[PDB]
Amino acid sequence: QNYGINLPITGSMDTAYANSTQEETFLTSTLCLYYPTEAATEINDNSWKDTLSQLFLTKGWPTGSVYFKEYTNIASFSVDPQLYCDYNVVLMKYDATLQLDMSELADLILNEWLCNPMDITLYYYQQTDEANKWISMGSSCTIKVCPLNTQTLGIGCLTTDATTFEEVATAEKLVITDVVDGVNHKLDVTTATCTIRNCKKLGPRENVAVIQVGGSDILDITADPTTAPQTERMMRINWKKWWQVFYTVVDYVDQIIQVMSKRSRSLNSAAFYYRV
Amino acid sequence: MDVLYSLSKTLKDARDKIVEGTLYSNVSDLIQQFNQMIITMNGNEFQTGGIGNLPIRNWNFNFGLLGTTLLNLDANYVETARNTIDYFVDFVDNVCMDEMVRESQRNGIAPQSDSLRKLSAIKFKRINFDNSSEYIENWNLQNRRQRTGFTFHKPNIFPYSASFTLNRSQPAHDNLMGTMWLNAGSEIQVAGFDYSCAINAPANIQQFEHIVPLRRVLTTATITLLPDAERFSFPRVINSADGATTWFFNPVILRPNNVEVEFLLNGQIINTYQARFGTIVARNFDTIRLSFQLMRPPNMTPAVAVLFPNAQPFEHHATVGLTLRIESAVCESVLADASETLLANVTSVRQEYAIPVGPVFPPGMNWTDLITNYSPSREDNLQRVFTVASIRSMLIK
Amino acid sequence: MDVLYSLSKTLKDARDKIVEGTLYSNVSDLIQQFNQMIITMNGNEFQTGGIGNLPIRNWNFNFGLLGTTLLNLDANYVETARNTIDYFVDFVDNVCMDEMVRESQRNGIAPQSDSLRKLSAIKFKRINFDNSSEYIENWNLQNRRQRTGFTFHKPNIFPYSASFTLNRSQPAHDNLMGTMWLNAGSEIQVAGFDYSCAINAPANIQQFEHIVPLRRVLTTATITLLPDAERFSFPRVINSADGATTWFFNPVILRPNNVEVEFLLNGQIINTYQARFGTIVARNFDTIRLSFQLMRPPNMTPAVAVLFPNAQPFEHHATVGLTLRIESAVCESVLADASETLLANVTSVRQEYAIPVGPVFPPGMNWTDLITNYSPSREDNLQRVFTVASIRSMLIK
Amino acid sequence: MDVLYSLSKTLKDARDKIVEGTLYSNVSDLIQQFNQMIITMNGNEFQTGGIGNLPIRNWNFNFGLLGTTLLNLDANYVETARNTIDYFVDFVDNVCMDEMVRESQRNGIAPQSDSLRKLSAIKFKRINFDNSSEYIENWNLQNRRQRTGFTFHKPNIFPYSASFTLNRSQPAHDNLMGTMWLNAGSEIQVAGFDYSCAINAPANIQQFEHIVPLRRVLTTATITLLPDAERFSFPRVINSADGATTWFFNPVILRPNNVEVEFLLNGQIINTYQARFGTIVARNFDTIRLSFQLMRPPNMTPAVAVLFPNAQPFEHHATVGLTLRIESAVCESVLADASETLLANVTSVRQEYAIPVGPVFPPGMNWTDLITNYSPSREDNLQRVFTVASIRSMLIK
Ligand SMILES: *[C@@]1(O)O[C@H](CO)[C@@H](O)[C@H](O)[C@H]1NC(C)=O
Numbered sequence A: 001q002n003y004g005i006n007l008p009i010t011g012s013m014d015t016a017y018a019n020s021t022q023e024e025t026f027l028t029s030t031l032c033l034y035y036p037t038e039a040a041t042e043i044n045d046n047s048w049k050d051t052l053s054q055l056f057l058t059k060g061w062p063t064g065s066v067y068f069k070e071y072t073n074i075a076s077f078s079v080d081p082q083l084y085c086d087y088n089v090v091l092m093k094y095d096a097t098l099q100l101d102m103s104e105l106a107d108l109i110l111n112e113w114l115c116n117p118m119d120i121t122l123y124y125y126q127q128t129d130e131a132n133k134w135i136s137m138g139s140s141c142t143i144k145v146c147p148l149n150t151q152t153l154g155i156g157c158l159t160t161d162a163t164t165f166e167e168v169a170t171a172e173k174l175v176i177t178d179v180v181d182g183v184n185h186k187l188d189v190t191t192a193t194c195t196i197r198n199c200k201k202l203g204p205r206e207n208v209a210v211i212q213v214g215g216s217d218i219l220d221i222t223a224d225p226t227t228a229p230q231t232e233r234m235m236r237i238n239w240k241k242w243w244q245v246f247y248t249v250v251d252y253v254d255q256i257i258q259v260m261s262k263r264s265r266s267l268n269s270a271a272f273y274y275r276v
Numbered sequence B, C, D: 001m002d003v004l005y006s007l008s009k010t011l012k013d014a015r016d017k018i019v020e021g022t023l024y025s026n027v028s029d030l031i032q033q034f035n036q037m038i039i040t041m042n043g044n045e046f047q048t049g050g051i052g053n054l055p056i057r058n059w060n061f062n063f064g065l066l067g068t069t070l071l072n073l074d075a076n077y078v079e080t081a082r083n084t085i086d087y088f089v090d091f092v093d094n095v096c097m098d099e100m101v102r103e104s105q106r107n108g109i110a111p112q113s114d115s116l117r118k119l120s121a122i123k124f125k126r127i128n129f130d131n132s133s134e135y136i137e138n139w140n141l142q143n144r145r146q147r148t149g150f151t152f153h154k155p156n157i158f159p160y161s162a163s164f165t166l167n168r169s170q171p172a173h174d175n176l177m178g179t180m181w182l183n184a185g186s187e188i189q190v191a192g193f194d195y196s197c198a199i200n201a202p203a204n205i206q207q208f209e210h211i212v213p214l215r216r217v218l219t220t221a222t223i224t225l226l227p228d229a230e231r232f233s234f235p236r237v238i239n240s241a242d243g244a245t246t247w248f249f250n251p252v253i254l255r256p257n258n259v260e261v262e263f264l265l266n267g268q269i270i271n272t273y274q275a276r277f278g279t280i281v282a283r284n285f286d287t288i289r290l291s292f293q294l295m296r297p298p299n300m301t302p303a304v305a306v307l308f309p310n311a312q313p314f315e316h317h318a319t320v321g322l323t324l325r326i327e328s329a330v331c332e333s334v335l336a337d338a339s340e341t342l343l344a345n346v347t348s349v350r351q352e353y354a355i356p357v358g359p360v361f362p363p364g365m366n367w368t369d370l371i372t373n374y375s376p377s378r379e380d381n382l383q384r385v386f387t388v389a390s391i392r393s394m395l396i397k
């Protein structure tokens, strides 16, 4: 039914509303709760997943609809984060050391990135506009950037010596690199354990929320210094026991689901707008 | 029809000119008309009413002539004429209410009541008097196929309409583009919006357009144009197109850039105005085409630059609007307006006597439903009923 | 000029009173006028048109008199008179369009076309009939130097103007003070603002003032005054004075304190009104002086007190405004208004026949440019052309 | 106008009845008409032409009467009358070409040329003869507001239109659904297609619909309906909607299932026909609504079953079409058709004398542009010019 074309939509400003339809969303869709692997250590139970899923039945979700996964830390969750089910929300502890790496994970999963491959040996590289970033993840990434000129000579670097290159990353599981836009560069990714990837952001992701368990509330999801917005789906709650953290999520499903939406890529109507 | 106006004209003048103490030469030609009414009307008999709750009355005329021999009129001459005028003015009320209530679909311009069909004989044509009112002059010019014209003050030419159009949308409803409008009475308020404020548009300019077709051709209009839509200026929540969800609209307002208003007639540009506000004219048109565009300001103070970022969260949405208003125009078909009460006299008769819905007019005489589908079968009925309502307004307010 | 109105008055009455079947005594004095038109006009010959695309036509009058011997008029008598009226009513259209299109700068009150100069002889003065219209009565009273007056409904006395004034400013544009206004048609909306909300003013009161001078003296006006400017109530971004940068204006609105409206005439206070809203009168004035002030509220709930701090970041700016509107007034010179269409008939003739720009009127008959510099040379031309447009509206709508 | 037909009627009869050797009693009443033409026309003088390359000619009438004293007409009587007829028949050609070439926008039904305005006096009304033609009879019935009617053979009621509509599409263009049509002259050929042949439709049935609104109301039409569109039956390549790419259409043709043709008038169903082909009637309508559907055949031989698989590569596309054709109908406004040449006489005069584009008619008298926007201002001009073209066709073919 006319998948590729864009067509305008008209509609009157005097039309009666539909029904409530928040219930029917709970009957059909799925839910994924994520937690660090030390949360289940304090719980001291092998049936607490059974215990929680009895409590989700009260708020309308059926039995086989809520899925639970684990991770060790945000350093090892971020080597490959992939979100599978319809709605989900992630839970992370506050670390005063991991300032930037909490903002990297909240950049990677809360937005949507269109990505192209790269070849360090063969070509020379540059960023076109403000939406172009170099997302690189793996076991151990170390990136050195040698900027060139209009004659392809080095500026501050020797284009043969790899020691005179200029380092932006050291042994990280994930890197998002912003360099100056419009200058050809020469690259030194250790590609045996890393994988650099020319990416490009579209509009953000609508089905994931982030619960920052404890600490202050700072997350630079954007790239500029001049702004740093705190959107609807990033939030913060304090803790002493991981039981109380889980009871608050189960009690207030109807508000957390309200703040997020379905992934607009996942629909039928995006059939040639990058996701069938 | 022509003799129904001629009965009401010389009953209006008979209550005005035949007063006590006046000189006889002031009324020497009215009495020759009023006596010649009576001679034609005697011996006949009529019957009005019968539809709805309108009661059936029988009329019978047996009166005597007026005296033509005084120098100054006295109180005997006035009081013997008032009890003749008061019987005729009760007869004309019940013929005019009998005709405003009936309608036909084949030929609506013909008389429909039983009494007005009987008055259209050549026996009754000698009652004919001058035809100087606006609606009876346009009744006669249009009956010979000559060009007519009605002058209106703020004519109800637009049906009620309040809607929108989204040229760019997604289910999150946070990056939108399109127009909103209100068309009601004789006023158009259109407003175009863009949430990104043309950050990725070519040359940072977003083009808008809104085209309003009319139902009848207007002539020599006086139009006021002002560069703000004051109705689409405040934060509001709006439902979706199919009534599923709701979406939020928080405007800030720039000025409209590069405004062009065009006045079309069969696709031909009659008039055009480019960045010219205030009062304008429009000599002949039947389609109004508004065009205006949003331009991102190239220089911004630090208080402005925080409002429009490059990234996705747009909390302050840009808005550009116009406002058009027709003050007075000349049409050729009958309409409703803000000065005269001919539409209010027709509906008040039908509502009072509980009249069933007929084949032509909308239920309840809804003007929004009547100007939407304004067929030539409804135009002939609407002129026939507004003209009878104009005759009744001379005698009975 | 007086005989051009007298031709149109008895052609309007000839189509209204000479109908089929009417009594002869109803039209016994019109036929003596209509026969005496024809006797004066026979043997003469005229010529109209020639400027722009207005074509050249030649006129020649050789007609016969009407019969004065019937008792009731029949269809022979009507149809032999309609083919005489239809030649005269075509002649008057082409004389009125020949005069609305021409103009002079030395003495604009004199006739300019070739046909209207020829009708101003004493041979043609016997066609003169009654002068009962509004514009032909004020043409004669003003020609003898007696006091005249035109009655208007919402007169276009204000030229279009939308601007501002900053009494306190800096290049950051974050602590401002001044007024904003819109003057358009017959409506004034002024609004004064202060970003600090009088935190450092003496006695926490900031005084505003806005003075509007008129072009002509109005008499016995009916004025509606309401204590809010609804146009300057929403957040907007405004350019600077020289178009360099833009600045942001986010209002919250208090009530206007200590309102005084004054109505001046040669610097003398004729009327004054102090904190009195609704409908007011103004008997004689030519300058409106609005005065109102902002007062910081001394007691504030905790929801209000967060809006107005002591320090520099002011995110909610205080705003005080008024709204004035003239409903109806009596002037002495001609103007435009919202009820009658005399301005629309003049511009529609000039636009249709592609008339070049002359020495007096603005290009395109722009009313904003014409009321701005409303010289006495333009006043004599504008009255001469609105009066001819009023004569043409009796015959041809 | 009525006397221009009356000049041409008795010049046509004068060349036919005044022959050599005929008896005098055969022409005894024509000569009394022809002598009474001459008496009215003597002493007058006329002037035609002036617009475009149409030359200016002056006309002057000073002729003598015909003899009324023979028993059988001889060659002296014929040859002295032929040199009078040949001057009048040259005069009527140049008045008819002067009127077909001019137009107005205010009141187009009035005469526009200088000669036809002069013939509309009561001096020239005694030339009036019988009015028996079709266009002069409908000129008089419509001038009194009575019901008229023109009878046409294949009327050009549809403007030219050839387009399509895709109800299901993708950029590969290999699984499509929608309709195609040609509306031209008096013929509609619509064809609906579906590439999947309803393999996933509910109950294997795909519904199509095509609605054609008319410009004027037709009456008592004779319509031929045949169940195949022969124009959309062969393989072709078609461009996209915006002219970007091209797409391929390879049809095989099933029969149309469940055909319903409806004939609407103000949204009311006047006539309906369900699976009835051949000749049908339509008494009163202004909107044709075709409805037909595709049904997948439930039983298929092995030669058919290979054509329609379940998977994606569809090399043979299903197609269902209809064909409608109006043979003859009765309208009330003038149109063009396939029998008479009144449109061809109007355009041939304007093309020959290099006439500039006026305010009403399209450039070049384009009939597709004229029936698309067929305003009431164009209807009054088009009837006035087709009627003059009908008068000229009696004398000069
Ligand atoms: C819902 O049941 O009721 C609505 C009106 O009360 C109606 O508009 C809508 O169709 C219904 N929706 C469903 C399927 O629940």
Ligand SMILES: [Ca+2]
Binding pocket: A156, A157, A164, A165, A166
């Ligand atoms: Ca270096």
Ligand SMILES: [Ca+2]
Binding pocket: A127, A129, A130, A132, A178, A179, A180, A181
């Ligand atoms: Ca960059």
Ligand SMILES: [Zn+2]
Binding pocket: B153, B338, C153, C338
């Ligand atoms: Zn008003």
Ligand SMILES: [Zn+2]
Binding pocket: D153, D338
């Ligand atoms: Zn044929």
